Assembly symmetry: D2
Homo-oligomer: 115 residues x 4
């Protein structure tokens, strides 16, 4: 996996399961081309989004459907979703873990980018 | 002031100063209409974006140009910007403070929402 | 005011009010000497803990009673408290704001340190 | 592993490697009995701290030596260390992941507690 997403729940202290994730690549359009999507697993992880071959350098957006997550739990959320937009390179490290820690009125997001 | 943005720098333990912020409102179509913009002051705060009258119910997006901020310090950060998207005033007028704490490869963001 | 504490609630998008805070200073031995205490106001802020004169160089510990806070809301949180331990004034007097954002199983904490 | 520690670096976007971690249990003394310790691995993880048998219910403290970490990197830090103090139970879920995301003037910490 050149790209994976991991989502944590700060209210329950658990992985955030069954969270919808959409990934997009910016076109020469400056519009957002759908690129990959999935639901987080029982461990709050989404793997298998793309391959090294297709994950070329460019700007990518990862959209995490946080509002549907909290609504399904019966908790009132603030944000429509959590978006992470970043340039994916070739020069440096190649595997990207985008992590998000979720609360109803806050979220933190980080990237772990390794060889 | 119904919409304020506060930005902190987690590397230096300081306000994040001169950070560009653009605000947008979603129309009955789904494109983002420009709504307000400004840049953070010496205290890392941006005020005076809007008024109670103008700040009606809707979906808003607050985009904070974190990349130019880090690049000005010589750092190539992970994110292009930090965007915060939320429904506002759907149960009546409220005051919203949108706060972001920034690191080169991470940021956290929280909202304080109060009823005046 | 050289030492202020600000506490936010990430579940409700609000200041964390009536949160107990105890501050301690480490002695030339390694036990923690009580230094100041208070509880956060309606805005989630606690001021007036100390003065420039009294707040000399040393290692300080700010302990925020997050567990009583959550328990008062019916929640059994993960942490017993959140403790923030830091050297202060080692290069001259500064003003320190210690901020904590709280969730039942998580918290973040940051310091804004300024030179008056 | 009933207990593990995972530490992330928010400045470099990597695991925090070679971070010293000390764990303590509160005695009837209200003093802090050393319980386990270790350095984080290349993946920012510390495993093998204890066993289900010895990890009985009680209050535990996890101390992460964040200042030594930043000093070794030549970056000025604010905190002496990051401490996490929590009660470890029997009633509910049994495996504890204590995660910390580190910046020089901030840190976030969460627990993922599962069966
Ligand atoms: O917990 C993990 O497994 C994890 C892995 C990669 C990045 C972050 C991770 N947790 C995490 C912990 C905090 Cl305190 C904040 C964020 Cl954003 C992620
Ligand atoms: O909100 C404030 O006024 C504030 C002031 C100083 C430091 C932090 C502050 N908020 C804050 C915002 C995030 Cl996203 C995380 C944390 Cl720990 C504090
Ligand atoms: Na975002
Ligand atoms: Na702590």
């Amino acid at each position: 996996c050149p790209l994976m997403v991991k989502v944590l729940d700060a209210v329950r202290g658990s992985p955030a399961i069954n969270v919808a994730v959409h990934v997009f690549r910016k076109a020469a359009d400056d519009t957002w081309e759908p690129f990959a999507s999935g639901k987080t697993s029982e461990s709050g992880e989404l793997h298998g989004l793309t391959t090294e071959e297709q994950f070329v350098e460019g700007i990518y957006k990862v959209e995490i459907d946080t509002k549907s997550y909290w609504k399904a739990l019966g908790i009132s959320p603030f944000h429509e979703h959590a978006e992470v937009v970043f340039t994916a390179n070739d020069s440096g490290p190649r595997r990207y873990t985008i992590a998000a820690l979720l609360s109803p009125y806050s979220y933190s997001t980080t990237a772990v980018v390794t060889n």
